[PDB]
Amino acid sequence: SAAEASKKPRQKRTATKAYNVTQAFGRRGPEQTQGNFGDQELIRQGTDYKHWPQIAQFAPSASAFFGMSRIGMEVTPSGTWLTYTGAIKLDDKDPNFKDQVILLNKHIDAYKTFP
Amino acid sequence: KPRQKRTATKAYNVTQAFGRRGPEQTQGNFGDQELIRQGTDYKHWPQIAQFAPSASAFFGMSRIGMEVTPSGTWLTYTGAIKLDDKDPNFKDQVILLNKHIDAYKTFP
């Protein structure tokens, strides 16, 4: 999958065991446009991760990405970039709210705790 | 239906699904009057949607945070997506995105 999955625009890629989060989206890190999400289990597995559906329930649809987010455009020496920022509210009345918080905390900035 | 999974259409438009356009943190700023009224029925929706991230890429590319605020618990996200200037459609993609970014500021 790697050679062919890598053919897609970055924002359309799907990470898997055969093409993991690092190969698709770069090493995790603190920099302003590095991704910071994923512990070692998610990084090596991507959408093969056992709880990927419980994570993906927070990812936005295309309509919601463009309806919810603050969208910008920056023209720089490296090219033309679409910038995005936003926030998705967790439903504290969802019976699984506490598990969702635990799941997100499991992966946010997790790279800080391993090489 | 969780806000992040909604899909806007002429019958259930961007305002109805996602709120009025505006400048504040949890408000969206994207879409002129036509896009707001039509959502994914907008004539150039597929050309906009090609920049929306897959679920894998949203969590792979973005800086993700979680915050408790005076209104509750939020997942925050930021990132940047590079347009492909080798794409013959590049010039039109820039025009299209530029047309909708902060369009509400000039609503007549």
Numbering used by the authors:
A (entry chain B): 250 to 364
B (entry chain A): 257 to 364
What did the authors write?
The SARS-CoV-2 nucleocapsid protein is a multifunctional protein with potential primary functions of binding to the viral RNA genome and packing it into a long helical nucleocapsid structure or RNP complex. The SARS-CoV-2 nucleocapsid protein consists of five domains: an N-terminal tail region (residues 1 to 40), an N-terminal RNA binding domain (residues 41 to 173, termed N-NTD), a Ser/Arg-rich linker region (residues 174 to 249, termed LKR), a C-terminal dimerization domain (residues 250 to 364, termed N-CTD), and a C-terminal intrinsically disordered region (residues 365 to 419, termed IDR). The N protein mediates ribonucleoprotein (RNP) complex formation via two key steps: packaging of the viral RNA genome and self-assembly of oligomerizations. Previous studies suggest that the coronavirus nucleocapsid contains multiple RNA binding sites, including the NTD, CTD, and C-terminal IDR regions.
To determine the precise structural information of the novel coronavirus SARS-CoV-2 N-CTD, we solved the N-CTD structure at a resolution of 2.0 Å with X-ray crystallography. One N-CTD monomer is composed of three 310-helices, five α-helices, and two β-strands, with an additional N-terminal α0-helix in the partial electron density of the traced molecule. Two N-CTD monomers utilize three regions to form a stable symmetrical dimer, with a buried surface area of 2618 Å2 (of the 8026 Å2 monomer surface) (calculated by the online PISA server). First, the most distinctive feature is the antiparallel four-stranded β-sheet that has domain swapping interactions between the two monomers. Second, residues F346, L353, V350, and I357 of the longest α5-helix form multiple intermolecular hydrophobic interactions with residues T329, M322, and I320 in the β1-strand. Last, the α1 helix forms a strong hydrophobic interaction with other monomer α4 helixes, like two clip-bars, to firmly fix the two monomers (i.e., A264-S312, Q260-S311, and Q260-Q306 interactions). SARS-CoV-2 N-CTDs form repeating cylindrical high-order structures with six dimers, which is slightly different from the SARS-CoV N-CTD octamer X-shaped high-order oligomer pattern. The dimer of SARS-CoV-2 N-CTD is shown as a cuboid shape containing an α-helix-rich side and a β-sheet side. The electrostatic surface suggests that the α-helix-rich side contains a positively charged channel, whereas the β-sheet side is a neutral surface. Nevertheless, the conserved positively charged channel of the α-helix-rich side is thought to be a potential RNA binding site in the SARS-CoV-2 N-CTD.
